[PDB]
């Protein structure tokens, strides 16, 4: 079930900065195959220049385009273990999600710094500095701790208390809860929605890069 749940998130979190360049992918599993939206993407997480790409249609061309973005990524210390072009270029799910992964991670959250503690742990603590207040909250982990919506709801309640009711939500309904704070924030503070709700729940252990990936952006509309 993480596949299916991270394919989700990994791509509407693509997505959201894809649009800001005017194009989006689809299918995560093929899109970044031959380099040049991967390469794109970099570009605008990062706000620097890539080297130019390469447009011709075959093998070698692509290879030299995911180059380009996993030469640049390793330039900004990310060191790539079991990555690697060419199955990028062949077209391995795995490893895409990965990557794609190790992107989000250095690039929406590695530089996210609160209170001496960065990255992850960083990301970790802000939401549990916002979600103190909130009794029916307590935020140990990226993912059983979110799994009943009202996590992601006290978020938004923070700082936008104009936005949601809190004070009407319960533990009852899960899925009503994501949806909830998904539309809210959709409609409100430009994040798609990036979590299936009904993967969530339906889960002991939901994925926590994908619930990472999805909080992060609250982090950054926010700040």
């Avoid at 190790?102 to 996210?112: E, H, S, V």
């Amino acid at each position: 079930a993480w596949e299916k749940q991270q394919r989700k998130t990994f791509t509407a979190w693509c997505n959201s900065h894809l649009r800001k360049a005017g194009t989006q992918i689809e299918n995560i599993e093929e899109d970044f195959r031959n380099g040049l939206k991967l390469m794109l993407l970099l570009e605008v997480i990062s706000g620097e220049r890539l080297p130019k790409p390469d447009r011709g249609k075959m093998r070698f061309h692509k290879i030299a385009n995911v180059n380009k973005a996993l030469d640049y990524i390793a330039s900004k210390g990310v060191k790539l273990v079991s990555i690697g072009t060419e199955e990028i270029v062949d077209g391995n799910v795995k490893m895409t999600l990965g990557m794609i992964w190790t992107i989000i991670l250095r690039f929406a959250i590695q530089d996210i710094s609160v209170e001496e503690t960065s990255a992850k742990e960083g990301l970790l603590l802000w939401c549990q500095r916002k979600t103190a207040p909130y009794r029916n909250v307590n935020i140990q982990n990226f993912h059983t701790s979110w799994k009943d919506g009202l996590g992601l709801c006290a978020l938004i309640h923070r700082h936008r208390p104009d936005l949601i009711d809190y004070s009407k939500l319960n533990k009852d309904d899960p899925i009503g809860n994501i949806n909830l704070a998904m539309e809210i924030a959709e409609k409100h503070l430009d994040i798609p929605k990036m979590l299936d709700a009904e993967d969530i729940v339906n889960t002991p252990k939901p994925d926590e890069r994908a619930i990472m990936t999805y909080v992060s952006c609250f982090y950054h509309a926010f700040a």
